[PDB]
Amino acid sequence: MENFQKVEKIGEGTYGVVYKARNKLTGEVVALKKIRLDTTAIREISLLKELNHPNIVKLLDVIHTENKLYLVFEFLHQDLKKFMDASALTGIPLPLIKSYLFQLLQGLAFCHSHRVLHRDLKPQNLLINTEGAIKLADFGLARAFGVPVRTYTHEVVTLWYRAPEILLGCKYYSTAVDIWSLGCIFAEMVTRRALFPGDSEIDQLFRIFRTLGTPDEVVWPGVTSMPDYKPSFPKWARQDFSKVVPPLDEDGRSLLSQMLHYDPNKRISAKAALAHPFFQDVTKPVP
């Protein structure tokens, strides 16, 4: 850990603090994340250094020193939450949005092929650069650390992007949870506000139901197998997407609709999402 100088604090993730640093040997800027390891998990994350893709934040190195675990990774100037916060009076150009989702599905498609999930995908672990690229951070860390109700700085974590199966108590959940979280990020990138901002797990479920209709055996076969399903949930009907996500075109709605499908089995995969008509005209404009 002695090779990292010029260390400045950038922010706070849900696992630890994030810094911008300088590699004394190479002279490059790097990002470090100090996850306080109070009490296998390291050897497994080191293996994540082997999963490289232009859309996966590069895990440069893992370092364990006296109760601290440092993730040295590729440095990107901003995340999607901040980028959307700043583009509030103009939003994001549809071409950039189509470019981002496209690159996001190639990173998901890459990681899923290797049975690596994220499970806690939020706009905050979606990192951007000045060249029009977007990359995923923190893949595979949740299956070592597990994602909590509260963070390390006791901040309240984000339920907003959780899949309905996770919320209804499914223990045997898919990689389709990531496609759900990404379908939420897609709509939010389009409307600039979270599609389902619930204040509790039950409110998050109700939020989902109000927009997409309350699930049943017709729209979600096997929904009655979910530990937390109750036949008394408020009864709502599926709303019209032309209303929910106005700027989006028919192809954009069709895909969002398929990424947000209730049944994990029927929910579009990253691989098949890439071949969707929506991406027929994808470009790559700068941020």
Partner: protein, 70 residues
């Protein structure tokens, strides 16, 4: 304390949920639906007609209320 949610409706019911503080929450039995006298006893100020109809097990401190429309 006690957070009272915004009311929300569907075709034949009106709803709302109430989040309970750690103190009051220790007074609510495990898998038990309450009567007005029972939830009112907890401090929940609400009009008459509201029915504690469901319990989301993972968050037993959230009381879910229902009431038929109109």
């Amino acid at each position: 304390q006690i957070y009272y949610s915004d009311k929300y409706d569907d075709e034949e019911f009106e709803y709302r949920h109430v989040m309970l503080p750690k103190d009051i929450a220790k007074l609510v039995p495990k898998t038990h639906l309450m009567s007005e006298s029972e939830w009112r006893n907890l401090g929940v100020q609400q009009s008459q007609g509201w029915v504690h109809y469901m319990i989301h097990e993972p968050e037993p401190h959230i009381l879910l209320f229902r009431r038929p429309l109109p």
